[PDB]
Every structure is written in structure tokens, then in C-alpha cells.
Amino acid sequence: TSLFTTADHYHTPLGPDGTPHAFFEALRDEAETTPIGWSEAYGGHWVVAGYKEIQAVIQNTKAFSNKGVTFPRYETGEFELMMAGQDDPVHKKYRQLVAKPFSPEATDLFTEQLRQSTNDLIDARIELGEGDAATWLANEIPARLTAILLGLPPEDGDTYRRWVWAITHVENPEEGAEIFAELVAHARTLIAERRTNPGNDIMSRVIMSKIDGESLSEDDLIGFFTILLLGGIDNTARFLSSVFWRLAWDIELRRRLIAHPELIPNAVDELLRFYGPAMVGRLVTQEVTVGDITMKPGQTAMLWFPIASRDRSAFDSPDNIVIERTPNRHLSLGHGIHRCLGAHLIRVEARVAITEFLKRIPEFSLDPNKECEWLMGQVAGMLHVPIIFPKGKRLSE
Ligand code: HEM
Ligand SMILES: CC1(C)O[C@]2(C)CC[C@H]1CC2
């Protein structure tokens, strides 16, 4: 038997712990013999699980195109995910427009805003002794940050989450497209207002930019708005949710982060390796042989980063969360020309979120009376993390 034959990132077998990690470990074991397998899912496609094979594919821009970045394709109507859904030269020219706001030096400037926000969110339920770590904290920290990045109202996370859900998981096609059309309508209004009353946000920045002499089309701007909205509300929320879940039951990892705050950055990278949400696809545009397999134009290859991040040939003791691991060349944020634009930002965000969470609530656990829930898909992570903790006090009010 072979686990590749029915491999499907939206339908990953879950173990008793509630995650797909037992399955990931088993597939990792099989990938030592067969690093790339054909899955019958989605009409048939390639599943690339070995670390060196993923590197070979992701570095080859000649035979692989990012037009297949989301598979099944995300619901974004007639729009494309800017940067992520493009190949060079188009990709490079668009990314250069937002490189500055995402530089490590620029992203460092969000630290205090994120520290205060995390604390403000925690105040909301600290006196209650219970709450869903995902919905209450993990979803909100990035939702608020992203809204600020886009010049949107921070208090409308449910609206943004509804759009994101439509793009990534709504099952009914029409309902999905109609809800994404809502995002487009809101974006149009935002763009027109920024057009005349600009601010210091990134949308404002791209609206005033120019490529080869001319301003970007409204459609291009909607693509920028969409991909940045997805990075925060989807990717970051699912990652942090899985992290909070882990910290709720792993009392060993938790006490060490509290005792060694200086290890938190390295710990964040190790958690990124272990709980990376993502996976990405690539559209084959040229017959190419990777490893022992030959791919043909028109086929799609899914890069299963979570399996590659557990490759024994790339990481010693891959199944353990070694907080002091360094270097840590995980693929959770991609590699090459499409490597995560938000890499430094999410490292800062995770450091702050974890630090403040453990500072305010050093003692907590999973709620024995409530169920945790894992969200499967191209971005996979905990969706519901009910926890309980001894009642505490608010910092403000
Ligand atoms: C923990 C959070 C996140 C994870 C795990 C994640 C992961 C990834 C990965 C795997 C890629 C590579 C795409 C490919 O190879 O095709 C990527 C690309 C990208 N990400 Fe992130 N991401 C996260 C958060 C964010 C955030 C917060 C933003 C920005 C606000 C963002 C913006 C982007 C953009 C624009 C690209 C495309 C870059 C390009 O094509 O050059 N991501 N991300
Ligand atoms: C899943 C992943 C990695 O995240 C986003 C934000 C960029 C590329 C793809 C699709 C959307």
C-alpha cells in the first residue's frame, strides 16, 4: 500500500491527539523510499514530500509555474493572487512595490502595537477563566494587525474572516463567489477613498505606486488587498492557534519558554517548522524529471512542506520540538523567489503573542468539557482551542 495514492491536503487522517501529525510522520517514513507519489485526488496530481525534491521543484522556475499556487484554486473570481500567483518578470516587479513595508526593520516597528493588542485581547476574558484560544486570541491578533496594514477597521474581523472562508472553504460555488464579490466591493470603496485621502498603510502605498511609468489597475490593487488579507487572517491565525493548542498541553515546552525568554525567537522558528500551516502547488509547464518521476505539462504538483519539514535527512530528531535548534532550514515559509513576504512580520508577531500570553496566563490547559477542532486544507491548523485557566486580572479597565 502507499499513502500517496489518496493523499489530499483537505482530507488528512487525524490521530487521537486531534492533528494529522501521525499521518504526516507515516507519509514521511514512506517518502524515504518514495519521495514523490501520484495521488488519485483532484483528478490526479503529484505529491512532493521529500525535502530535497521540494527544493528541486521550488527552485525550478523553468518547468514550474506559480499559476498553480493554490490547488484546488482559491475562489478569487477573475482576480489573481498578486505575487504568489505570478511568475517573473511580472512577479518581481510587483513584489518590489511592497518590499519596504515588510523589511525586517519596518516589521520590527509593530512590536509594541502587537504587545498592547495581545494584552488587550487577553483582558477580554482573563477574569473568566475560560475561552477558545483560537477565536479569542490567535484569530484576533493577526486580524487586527492585517486590518491596520490594509487601512481597514480593526473591529470587523468577522467580516474579513467571512471573506477568507469564502475564498478558501465555502463548499457551494455560488455562495462562495458571491461572498468574495463582497470583498471586491469593499476593496473598491477603500481604494477610491485612499486615492483621495491616503494614509501610511500598504494599500495607500501601492495605490500611489507606478510600474514602468503607470499606476496599477484597480484589479491589480484588489489582488494585493486579497493576498495580504489571506496571509494574516488565514495563515497566521491557523499557525498561532496550533501553537496555543500545543502550549496548552505540553507543560514541558511551556515551562522552558517561560524560563528562557531569550529562546523564544528560536522556538518560534522551530514551531514554524513543526506547525507550518501551508502547502503550495505548482503548475508543470515543461516535461521535467524530478527524482524518479517525470511530470508533464498541465499536471500539478503539491509541495507538502509539513512532510519535508520532518525529513530525517534534513533535520536531526525531526519529530521533536527542539527549541534550541539552529540552523533551522524549514520550508514552512517557502524558499526561493516566492519565499513568504511576511516572514519577518510573523516571526515578530509570534514572539510577541507567545511572550505575552505566557506572561499573563502561565497556567492553563485544554478544556476537558469542550472539543478542539482542526481545520484541514491548503492552510491547516487548529480552528478551535478551548482552554481553561485560573481567573486573573485585567491590565486595563
Ligand atoms: C504563519 C504565517 C504564514 C505562513 C506559514 C506563510 C507561508 C507562505 C509560504 C509557504 C509562501 C510561499 C509561496 C510559494 O512558494 O508559492 C508564502 C508566500 C507569501 N506570503 Fe506568507 N505565510 C504566512 C503569513 C503571511 C502574512 C502575514 C503575509 C503578509 C501580510 C504573507 C504574504 C505572502 C506573500 C505576499 C507571499 C507571496 C510572495 C511571493 O510570491 O514572492 N504571508 N507564505
Ligand atoms: C497558502 C499560501 C502559502 O498563503 C498565501 C497567503 C500566499 C501563497 C499561498 C496562497 C495564499
Task: Give the DSSP per-residue string, 50-114.
Answer: SHHHHHHHHH-TTTEEGGGSSSSPP--TT---TTTT--TTHHHHHHTTTTGGGSHHHHGGGHHHH
Are the CB atoms for 208 and 224 separated by under 8 Å?
no
Amino acid code (one letter) for 265:
P
DSSP lists the bridge partners of residue 131 as 387
Ligand with minimal distance to 203 CA: 1
In 3D space, the residue among 358, 126, 327 whose CA is nearest the CA of residue 256 turns out to be 358
Half-sphere exposure at residue 281, Cβ-oriented, CA atoms within 13 angstroms: 24
Q: Max CA-CA distance within the chain?
A: 63
CB-based contacts of 297, cutoff 8 Å, min separation 6? 284, 285, 286, 287
Prior bond of 89 cis (ω within 30°)? yes
Rg (CA), the chain: 21
Write the burial class of residue 266 (CB in 10 Å: 0-12 exposed, 13-18 middle, 19+ buried). Answer: middle
Rounded to 5 degrees, what are φ and ψ at 153? -65, 125
Identify the DSSP state of 136.
I
CA-84 nearest atom, ligand 2 = 8
Dist CA 377 CA 308 (whole Å): 17
Fold exhibited by the domain 1-397: Cytochrome p450 (1.10.630)
Strand order in the sheet with 300-303: 36-39, 45-48, 300-303, 280-284, 64-65
Are the CB atoms for 160 and 152 separated by under 8 Å?
yes
Residue 175 cell numbers, joined: 455562495
Are the CB atoms for 247 and 358 separated by under 8 Å?
yes
**Secondary structure (3-state) at 374:** strand
Q: Which helix (H) or strand (E) holds 119?
A: helix 111-126
Q: Give, using CA atoms, the residue closest to atom 21 of ligand 1.
A: 340
In 3D space, the residue among 311, 300, 220 whose CA is nearest the CA of residue 24 turns out to be 311
In 3D space, the residue among 125, 160, 123, 163 whose CA is nearest the CA of residue 145 turns out to be 160
Residue indicated by cell numbers 533551522 = 328
| Number of residues written out for the chain | 397
Residue 337 cell numbers, joined: 523567489
Amino acid code (one letter) for 134:
A
Are the CB atoms for 28 and 7 separated by under 8 Å?
no
- Calculate helix-pair angle for 343-360, 237-249, nearest 10 degrees: 30
CA-231 nearest atom, ligand 2 = 6
Are the CB atoms for 23 and 13 separated by under 8 Å?
yes
Dist CA 5 CA 39 (whole Å): 4
Question: Is 340 annotated as ligand-binding?
Answer: yes
How many DSSP H helices and E strands does the chain contain? Answer: 16, 12
Centroid of ligand 2 to alpha carbon of 17 (angstroms): 26
Dist CA 202 CA 232 (whole Å): 14
Residue indicated by cell numbers 525535502 = 51
CB-based contacts of 125, cutoff 8 Å, min separation 6? 131, 136
Per-residue CA distances from 152 to 8, 135, 377 (Å): 35, 20, 27
* Sign of the CA dihedral running 349, 107, 156, 233: negative
Q: What is the stated resolution of the deposited model, in angstroms?
A: 1.7
| Measured CA angle at 88 (ends 225, 76), to 5 deg | 30
Residue indicated by cell numbers 508577531 = 349
CB-based contacts of 108, cutoff 8 Å, min separation 6? 344, 348
Dist CA 325 CA 21 (whole Å): 20
Identify the DSSP state of 292.
T
Residue indicated by cell numbers 498592547 = 116
Are the CB atoms for 151 and 362 separated by under 8 Å?
no
**Secondary structure (3-state) at 46:** strand
Dist CA 308 CA 50 (whole Å): 5
Q: Give, using CA atoms, the residue closest to atom 37 of ligand 1.
A: 84
Q: Which residues line ligand 2 (CB under 6 A)?
A: 69-70, 81, 84, 227, 230-231, 235, 278, 280, 378-379
